Amino acid sequence: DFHGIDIVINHRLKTSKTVPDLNNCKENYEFLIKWTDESHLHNTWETYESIGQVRGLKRLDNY
């Protein structure tokens, strides 16, 4: 019944180097996240500072 992160769909950049770290992935890339308990038609391009603390976060870290 909770509105958490299920799987990851697509990924792109948000703001239009040798190795981008997690900070560059936060303030430089947006990711299409599929939410649990919901169809795949409600995929939204979200990051970390736009959703806050949500259920399930290690999957997007590994991806």
Place this chain on the structure above:
DNA sequence: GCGCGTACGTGCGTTTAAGCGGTGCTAGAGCTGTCTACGACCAATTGAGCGGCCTTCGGCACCGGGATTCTGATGGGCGGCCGCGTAT
């Protein structure tokens, strides 16, 4: 008792491999069947084994005889006693 520290329990997510029932294959247990070697049994003779009884040399620790070293009464000779004592 108390206080500091941290490691181990509880959670979620990721991940890895047990358990399920499906088939195939043949090895190794179990059965089976004939022979005969090896163990039980009975016999008769013999000495290893047990009770009965007292053995001898070597090793621990107490011992043995003879020369030699240290302590004690002995003794003439050089000195000191100053105080009673006989002679003029």
